[PDB]
Design a protein around this ligand. Structure first.
Ligand SMILES: COc1ccc2nc(NC(=O)C3CC3)sc2c1
Length: 119
């Protein structure tokens, strides 16, 4: 029932994501010189370095907020892809499956700890 445990769990999951070759396109903000129309489609850019920096600055209050930003990385990829068969989008789908598989226990444990705190 540790209310704070999610933070280090998220740090470790981000470390695993950075070791995945599938995270390459998502490690830093999308390069606007490479994709000049990116901001005409995507209103809120997001990337894993921004997520890691937000976490390390103490600017996430819960793992749900971190999960919302990670999911935005994947929805941006889906919105920007010209095809569902594109390389970068295909990498985003595998990385999303990996992330969802690992974040589920983090969210469950945190929500359970909060419920215990308010019992
Ligand atoms: C910024 O995130 C994405 C997501 C999907 C994505 N699909 C792409 N496709 C191409 O470049 C084709 C050779 C023409 S570039 C790209 C970039």
């Amino acid at each position: 029932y540790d209310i704070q445990a999610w933070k280090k769990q998220c740090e470790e999951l981000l470390n695993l994501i950075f070791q995945c070759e599938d995270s390459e396109p998502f490690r830093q903000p999308v390069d606007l010189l490479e994709y000049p129309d990116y901001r005409d489609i995507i209103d809120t850019p997001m990337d894993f370095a921004t997520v890691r920096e937000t976490l390390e600055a103490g600017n996430y209050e819960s793992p749900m907020e971190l999960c919302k930003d990670v999911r935005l990385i994947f929805s941006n990829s889906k919105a920007y892809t010209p095809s569902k068969r594109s390389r970068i989008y295909s990498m985003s789908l595998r990385l999303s499956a990996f992330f969802e598989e690992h974040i589920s226990s983090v969210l469950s444990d945190y929500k359970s700890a909060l419920r215990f705190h308010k019992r």
